[PDB]
Amino acid sequence: PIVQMVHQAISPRTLNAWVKVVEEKAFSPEVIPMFSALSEGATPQDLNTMLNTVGGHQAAMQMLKETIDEEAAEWDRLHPVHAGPIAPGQMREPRGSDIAGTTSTLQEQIGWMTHNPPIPVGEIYKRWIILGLNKIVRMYSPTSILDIRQGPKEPFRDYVDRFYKTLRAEQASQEVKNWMTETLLVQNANPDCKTILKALGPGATLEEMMTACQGV
Amino acid sequence: PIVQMVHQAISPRTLNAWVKVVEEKAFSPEVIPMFSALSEGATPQDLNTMLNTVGGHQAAMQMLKETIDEEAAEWDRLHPVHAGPIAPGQMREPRGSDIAGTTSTLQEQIGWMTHNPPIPVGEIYKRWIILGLNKIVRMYSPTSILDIRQGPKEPFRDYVDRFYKTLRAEQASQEVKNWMTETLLVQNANPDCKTILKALGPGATLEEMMTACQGV
Amino acid sequence: PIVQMVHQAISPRTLNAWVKVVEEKAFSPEVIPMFSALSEGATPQDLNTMLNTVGGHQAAMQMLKETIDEEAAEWDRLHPVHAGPIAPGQMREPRGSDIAGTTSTLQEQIGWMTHNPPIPVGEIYKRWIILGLNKIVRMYSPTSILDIRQGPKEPFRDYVDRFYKTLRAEQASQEVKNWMTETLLVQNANPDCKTILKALGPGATLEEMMTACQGV
Amino acid sequence: PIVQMVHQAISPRTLNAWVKVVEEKAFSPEVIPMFSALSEGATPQDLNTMLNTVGGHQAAMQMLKETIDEEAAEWDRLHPVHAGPIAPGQMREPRGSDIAGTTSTLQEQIGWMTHNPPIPVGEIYKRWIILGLNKIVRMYSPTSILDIRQGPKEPFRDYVDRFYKTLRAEQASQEVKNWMTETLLVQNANPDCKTILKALGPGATLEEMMTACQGV
Amino acid sequence: PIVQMVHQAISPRTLNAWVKVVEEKAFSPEVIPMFSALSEGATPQDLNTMLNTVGGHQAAMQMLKETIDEEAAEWDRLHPVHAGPIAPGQMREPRGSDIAGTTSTLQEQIGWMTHNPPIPVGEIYKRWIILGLNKIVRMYSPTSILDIRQGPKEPFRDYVDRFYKTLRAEQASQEVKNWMTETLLVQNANPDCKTILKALGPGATLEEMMTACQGV
Amino acid sequence: PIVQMVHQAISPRTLNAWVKVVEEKAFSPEVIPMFSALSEGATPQDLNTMLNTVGGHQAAMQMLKETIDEEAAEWDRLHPVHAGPIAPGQMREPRGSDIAGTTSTLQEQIGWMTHNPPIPVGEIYKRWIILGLNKIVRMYSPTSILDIRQGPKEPFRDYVDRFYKTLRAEQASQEVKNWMTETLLVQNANPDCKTILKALGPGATLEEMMTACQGV
Known part of the structure; x- marks a missing residue:
């Protein structure tokens, strides 16, 4: 160098x-x-x-x-x-x-x-x-981001780990990524935690989301 | 750099x-x-x-x-x-x-x-x-500081280790931390050592506390 | 730095x-x-x-x-x-x-x-x-220096190792340490080697002491 | 140095x-x-x-x-x-x-x-x-490049790995190498994937070829 | 430093x-x-x-x-x-x-x-x-140089290894060491090789000695 | 330094x-x-x-x-x-x-x-x-160069490995080494490969020799 x-x-x-x-x-x-x-x-x-x-x-x-x-x-x-x-x-x-x-x-x-x-x-x-x-x-990358779905008994924190892992390897701009974050993450969460999040509104932080689904 | x-x-x-x-x-x-x-x-x-x-x-x-x-x-x-x-x-x-x-x-x-x-x-x-x-x-952090309690047969020195470990990860200012130190540590000690400490008064050092509960 | x-x-x-x-x-x-x-x-x-x-x-x-x-x-x-x-x-x-x-x-x-x-x-x-x-x-330190005593079948050289190990961790000044060296070391040796040392007088070096008790 | x-x-x-x-x-x-x-x-x-x-x-x-x-x-x-x-x-x-x-x-x-x-x-x-x-x-090198042929159930991506591995050790100029790339690679692929590639034409990239044979 | x-x-x-x-x-x-x-x-x-x-x-x-x-x-x-x-x-x-x-x-x-x-x-x-x-x-050092003697079936080269090892730890000047080299080494060799060396005279090199006893 | x-x-x-x-x-x-x-x-x-x-x-x-x-x-x-x-x-x-x-x-x-x-x-x-x-x-070195002979079923390439290994440790000048190379190597090869080499003449390179005996 x-x-x-x-x-x-x-x-x-x-x-x-x-x-x-x-x-x-x-x-x-x-x-x-x-x-x-x-x-x-x-x-x-x-x-x-x-x-x-x-x-x-x-x-x-x-x-x-x-x-x-x-x-x-x-x-x-x-x-x-x-x-x-x-x-x-x-x-x-x-x-x-x-x-x-x-x-x-x-x-x-x-x-x-x-x-x-x-x-x-x-x-x-x-x-x-x-x-x-x-x-x-x-x-x-074997997996597409669309495919990452929260297992029924999967702690939210692990699902997030698989989501952003898979996202980090996707072919997409930021604006697209943003959309995927704002859209899919909540869409593909398991029903129990899906609801809970919906109830926070659609502008809460990740910190807020992960701490919202922590007990479930 | x-x-x-x-x-x-x-x-x-x-x-x-x-x-x-x-x-x-x-x-x-x-x-x-x-x-x-x-x-x-x-x-x-x-x-x-x-x-x-x-x-x-x-x-x-x-x-x-x-x-x-x-x-x-x-x-x-x-x-x-x-x-x-x-x-x-x-x-x-x-x-x-x-x-x-x-x-x-x-x-x-x-x-x-x-x-x-x-x-x-x-x-x-x-x-x-x-x-x-x-x-x-x-x-x-899985644990809250409130939860750290001295096991019946736990040497004081280990309890302290779990206390300040758990404290090091808490969300709190120093003044709060101080309070937790001055309040909880003695509160959540096992009865035998709890007494002994109480008997030193409430301004003794950690060195003094750990050496007070050393035999017990 | x-x-x-x-x-x-x-x-x-x-x-x-x-x-x-x-x-x-x-x-x-x-x-x-x-x-x-x-x-x-x-x-x-x-x-x-x-x-x-x-x-x-x-x-x-x-x-x-x-x-x-x-x-x-x-x-x-x-x-x-x-x-x-x-x-x-x-x-x-x-x-x-x-x-x-x-x-x-x-x-x-x-x-x-x-x-x-x-x-x-x-x-x-x-x-x-x-x-x-x-x-x-x-x-x-678990042990006090007073407690270090030479095992009946313990080679002197090992006893010395435990003595100065335990001494290195004691709370004491040098003058005190000196005293402990000059007093205890010979006092707490096993009878056989205790005698032998006594016979050298009380100003012989460690080299002299360890080589005096080498065969025993 | x-x-x-x-x-x-x-x-x-x-x-x-x-x-x-x-x-x-x-x-x-x-x-x-x-x-x-x-x-x-x-x-x-x-x-x-x-x-x-x-x-x-x-x-x-x-x-x-x-x-x-x-x-x-x-x-x-x-x-x-x-x-x-x-x-x-x-x-x-x-x-x-x-x-x-x-x-x-x-x-x-x-x-x-x-x-x-x-x-x-x-x-x-x-x-x-x-x-x-x-x-x-x-x-x-034990193997010649002529010998590298795609196994019937071999994923394309592995075959490619063996091809260019074996190629990297061959005695040949680039122009020759080019020819080998443009000629053999597709020639020695297994029938299923051979066809698929042929159908892309003879100027598609490796990225295109490996993604063409990905499912097969 | x-x-x-x-x-x-x-x-x-x-x-x-x-x-x-x-x-x-x-x-x-x-x-x-x-x-x-x-x-x-x-x-x-x-x-x-x-x-x-x-x-x-x-x-x-x-x-x-x-x-x-x-x-x-x-x-x-x-x-x-x-x-x-x-x-x-x-x-x-x-x-x-x-x-x-x-x-x-x-x-x-x-x-x-x-x-x-x-x-x-x-x-x-x-x-x-x-x-x-x-x-x-x-x-x-557990061993004295006087004690190093060539085993009956010991290759000379190993004996030498034990000799100079033990010598390296002795309390002695060079002149003394020299003497030990010139005297003992040949003295404490096993009979078969002892003879062979004696026959070279008393000023041959180590290289010469070790190559003299190589077959035996 | x-x-x-x-x-x-x-x-x-x-x-x-x-x-x-x-x-x-x-x-x-x-x-x-x-x-x-x-x-x-x-x-x-x-x-x-x-x-x-x-x-x-x-x-x-x-x-x-x-x-x-x-x-x-x-x-x-x-x-x-x-x-x-x-x-x-x-x-x-x-x-x-x-x-x-x-x-x-x-x-x-x-x-x-x-x-x-x-x-x-x-x-x-x-x-x-x-x-x-x-x-x-x-x-x-345990072995002399004279002793290195090609095993009946030994691939030439291994024999060469033992030859030049043993040669690298010999006491000899280059001119001598050269001679050993030009003389012995071919002399001590196993009959099958011995012949093959003889047939190349006595000025072929090692590359040529090792590639001549590769199949045998």
Whole structure:
């Protein structure tokens, strides 16, 4: 990575941390922040490192390649490279593949990130990666949010745990999510607690809802 | 984080430490300092990191979102953003969402914390987070303090352990806590030791009380 | 902490180290140095951190609160705060609660420790803490030193191990300790080895005593 | 290694990390990035270190020697050393064996890497090493890509996992790989899912393919 | 410690390392270097730290106190403190107890070590400690070197292992050790190998001896 | 160690790493690089540290002493110390024992390594150590290379593994090794694969040989 701005190789424990994550948890929503976290300040070399050191889950990893490409081609369209001698004081325009680390050197990468104005390739690529991770997570969720219904003898607090778990992996904007929260959660609660909540009105907080259904 | 003031990505072991905590201990009062501890000097990115990397406990995590929002909206009310070009030497007023890390960049965050006067967003947000943690802890305690009573054959020292454990999670100010200490602790002791304590008067220390009931 | 003088957040492994200690060993004499060790250079924030991250042992932790208060009130008596505007170049007098970290900011704490003359709040508070730890250790020892007697078939070397173990937790000054060493140790040895030692006189070293009773 | 440019010995945990990798995973495609990752910024001493500290897998390690030599001799051919006194301000031309660390000192190595223009021996040698690793990986794969066929009751997602796993170890250029992707993957799918895919046309994404065969 | 010269608190892992050592291996000759190793650059605070954090082995630890005192009193005799105002630019003469860390502050300690000429209290005290460790090790060895005799069916290489193990813990100078090597080792070998060695003469190396008795 | 040039104590994990190695693997060829690796930049104090902290394997360790001495005496012969006052700006000539760390201080050691011209005692001694390690490894190998023969049903790849393993521990120069490679390997292969190889000629690579005997 690069700490704010002097350059560093990615640390063995960052690395090791990132590997373990994927072994243990597969593609679980939390992986994603973890990833970002482990990649704070990362160059594309470092991001590639993280990605290539995953073994197994190769269908996913392939899918992530495609996505990155899609994002790369989109970059190139918007940002077409111009012909000419890159002057002494300057540095070349980055392609998609230069962004993905594939067709750029560590110097070039370091070039783009530090230069003024900053061309934050490390952060760009990361976005594309995260993008591709969401595709995966969302695909690899077995359950839809519509399906999460409160078991007859299920404490409310567990149902909520399954709801927002399943929600965290859904393909949807916030506005949509909001709607799902405001609509479904109460709709799919078990009759006993369903009633109780209805009786609070439709603007009570979660704290209020979970404490309303606590005894039941 | 930022060490006093040069910027750093959050360390893999901080991270890993914070994850383990939540897996093992769920929402136990001690988690909270741990959190603060692990977040000394943290930016909102770092705080978000910590929070998003929790998997499971999603009802709680949702509840924590609400609270943060509540605190954010309250900020905005008191601190309304004004219209105008942010001058060359200056930086914009932070919203609630800029405080929660959501609508601000790492640069902006670094901006606010280092600038003179310091606008300590990292510490603000942390307070809001801790606030929301207390809501959770307090909710997720099964037992009320009123219920902690000394078993007939329970050594005083264990009863005390259950008392202050249960107290540490209660919703109450210090003055209230004080009262509970001064009132209940002696009230809910088993008869044998109840008497003995009464006989010391009502201003003896805990050291004195625990050593008074040691043989019994 | 602060390394000699640039400021640092307490390290995850310090933290983690301090937690494990208390889980494993409860309140064993060695904990105390460990504590000091883990707190070399610590601010009150750091010391509080250490203390609050203990879960369980809440009677003790409560007792430690009382002691700290007692020490705080004593500070205040001797060091009464004066009224007035803290001038531009100066910083306010610290209360007890400012010393315990409770009513002071990290800046203020950093202020007091670095300023000339140094007002070492980190070291003061630590003393008060250690003080309160001794109260605990001493209370939580099951055995008195008077009770440690050499088993009939007990090798001297083990008896010594139990003696100084039990001694390390006693409430006593050195002069008292000395006396206990010079008096009891030989008094409570089993007859066979009791004699042998008596025969060396009453100023022989431990090395000499343990090697005198080695065959028996 | 050397961090951008001050010199460091390779860290115990890098080391240890690299050893564990080879014990556990033998020669699995992911090892390779791991290697690169663990060697970011590495001198030939550091690279040799990594290699010599492998025990077992000595046939491979021998094969890797040969390859390195082959690459070294090729260097020498293209880059023949000239006779003469290496002037005061200069440093000698590197042989292959100077590149492999074998016939050069750490100073010389440090010389070549830092000097302007940079003669990046650390990166050269690494390429040769990685080259030799591919030879090994490719040899030590039991299965050919032609052989990966979808089991009758095999979920598509697993088949894909075996396909790209086996592909990752094949001896082939990208263009070839592309062809294999575009040709075989669909060819070797089980009849039920084979049909379904055919029906999407021959330019659909993997995401589309895996979600097309998800129910079947 | 102090790294050459900026001051540091002793690291959690140094600490932890030193504790584990004593738990696992008790007082085994190797502990000693380990100790020294773990204490490279250590102040007396750091050395005390190491020592006090040992739990159990309290007879030893007591014996080590005595020794340190003996060494301290000897210092004082040779180095008597003089009366007078320690001038502005100067620092006081160190007692034994100031050397053992007991009656000196961390500043004073830092004072003595850095000042010119260097008064290396950290290294002095360490010597006294190591001294006291040898007393212990030597006492806590069950076996004398005279007793190590080669079993009838014992491979020479194992006998040697027991010999030099037992030798490493003996109370003796080198010249004495030399003699023991040159005399006993061959004397206490089993007849078959005894002869064989005798036949090499009395100046052959260990390598030669162990390879002479390899088949037998 | 010393990082290029500011001085450091050897790290707890280096230490710990080096200990584990010797416990687990005894004297296996790979230990040696590991050693070198763990000692990059090491002073003789650090090298001694590493060596003395080995417990068990005392015959070896004794043998290593002898060797070091032999190398030390050889140094002294070639490099005889001259009589005279070591001038103000200078430093004394190093003996063998000063090289082995035994009769020199850490300052002196630091003196020799940093001074211009560099007198790299740390690297000298290391060579002598490694030398003595080879003596050991070579002795402690049970098997000779002549004895490694391919089992009738042994896959070639395993035989190769045993060959180069056993070769790595032999006492021999490269030219000799080369010969052994070019002669024996094919000679001691099982008849079926022996033939096949013979048929490739006597200049084919290992890659070619192992892939020639892969099916058989």
